[PDB]
């Protein structure tokens, strides 16, 4: 995920997280991807394109 030049930070979370809210097994891979202002870093490359 971090390979893509259009992703800023990235966060991998696998399972739950000391909170009654999250109920995800250790299978449940759940990641937060941080994106850069579309000032960077590409021509075209829209959201769905990135996706």
């Amino acid at each position: 995920i971090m390979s893509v030049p259009e992703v800023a930070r990235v966060f991998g979370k696998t399972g739950k997280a000391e909170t009654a809210t999250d109920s995800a097994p250790l299978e449940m891979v759940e990641t937060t991807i941080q994106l850069k202002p579309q000032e960077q870093w590409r021509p075209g490359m829209t959201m769905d394109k990135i996706i």
Partner: protein, 394 residues
């Protein structure tokens, strides 16, 4: 999960749930306990931050322990932050590992070992005593706080002796407690951190602000070589979106002013257009406050297109006002007659605004999750429109 019918005083609903939560505590296992949820919805996940170290000095287990009994306590203090989830890391664990062959030799069963542990780690005192004049409180600690202590647990012993200790049939070693949630940051990898959750309904933006000042202030205390790297800041989408609507509205006034200028060849309509909106805008914000709805993208989306459909009352008034003046340019009380005919153009205009609002109800009728998602865009408009009708008359 317990689901209630839409629109029930949440706290009430949470109160009712508890009724029978107490009848159950004793029927389930030992130590195992029932937990009522937090207080936030699935939206409440506001700010997320990783706890990494720009070096190797501080341990993975150390970090989790840092986030658990320091940071988490620091942030939960903040106003409308319900709870500060802890994610990933690893749990410092005191592992007593038995050796079957050692057990056989000394002939002490597991039950025996377990009974010892539960009886090797407690503290107590028993009243005070009148030495001198002051009274002294009498205490004692049997506190497990050194591996020395873990080892020195009597299991089997006898008279005139030797004493079999725990060190004699097991190795006490710190370890990683069986993991239930693993967190990581970028390719670098494996790191502990924590999420911040918003106690239902309360400008998340502000909560993030309050958090960020704290963090800034806290970083001084942090050990050497650990950074709080933000992984999430709801504020950005809130800011981005809000600045978006801040611009469109002004842009809308200027577009209107320009179009007016071409049609009425310049007129104070500038202040007239800008006056009609903010007022019809300011009533929508007066009402939603009262019935405490929100300020989600939908509600804001509502006032936006409302601006577009509130033009006719201003446009239609002005035309008729402009045309009425011209009759006196061709030829107090005479400004009053211009108003009289501004009154002739009133009735049906006014009523057209009112008729426009009522038609929106079918949209309220839909009652999905989406339907309730759209209620905002419609609630803001529906109440803004009626007031826009009165607006038009003022």
């Amino acid at each position: 999960y317990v689901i209630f019918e839409d629109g029930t005083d949440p706290y009430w609903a949470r109160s009712r749930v508890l009724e029978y939560l107490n009848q159950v505590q004793g029927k389930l296992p030992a130590g195992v306990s029932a937990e009522l949820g937090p207080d936030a919805t699935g939206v409440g996940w506001i700010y997320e931050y990783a706890l990494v170290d720009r070096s190797g000095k501080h341990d993975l287990a150390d970090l989790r322990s840092l986030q658990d009994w320091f940071l988490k306590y620091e942030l939960k203090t903040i106003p409308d932050v319900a709870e500060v989830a802890s994610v990933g890391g690893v749990v410092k664990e005191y592992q007593v590992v038995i050796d079957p062959q050692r057990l056989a030799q000394y002939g002490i069963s597991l039950a025996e070992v377990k009974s010892a542990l539960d009886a090797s780690n407690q503290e107590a005192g028993g009243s005070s005593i009148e030495l001198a004049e002051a009274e002294y409180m009498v205490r004692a600690s049997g506190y497990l706080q050194t591996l020395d202590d873990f080892n020195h647990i009597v299991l089997k012993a006898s008279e005139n002796g030797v004493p079999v200790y725990l060190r004699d049939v097991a190795k006490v070693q710190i370890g990683p407690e069986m993991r239930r949630g693993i967190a990581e940051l970028n390719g670098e990898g494996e790191v502990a951190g924590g999420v911040v959750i918003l106690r239902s309904g309360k400008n998340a933006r502000e909560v993030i602000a309050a958090v960020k000042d704290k963090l800034e202030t806290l970083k001084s205390s942090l050990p050497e070589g650990v950074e709080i790297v933000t992984t999430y800041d709801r504020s950005q989408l809130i800011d981005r979106a809000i600045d978006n609507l801040s611009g469109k509205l002004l842009e809308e006034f200027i577009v209107v002013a320009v179009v007016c200028a071409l049609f009425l060849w310049h007129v104070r309509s500038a202040l007239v257009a800008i006056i009609s909106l903010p007022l019809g805008l300011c009533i929508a914000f007066i009402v939603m406050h009262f019935q405490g709805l929100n300020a989600n993208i939908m509600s804001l989306g509502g006032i936006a297109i409302a601006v577009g459909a509130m033009v006719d009352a201003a446009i239609v008034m002005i035309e008729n006002a402009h045309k009425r003046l011209e009759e006196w340019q061709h030829q107090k009380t005479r400004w009053q007659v211009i108003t009289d005919a501004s009154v002739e153009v009133g009735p049906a205009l006014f009523i057209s605004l009112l008729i426009i609002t009522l038609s929106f109800i079918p949209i309220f009728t839909l009652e999905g999750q989406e339907g309730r998602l759209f209620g905002p865009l419609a609630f803001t408009k529906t109440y803004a429109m009626a007031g826009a009708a009165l607006l038009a008359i003022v």
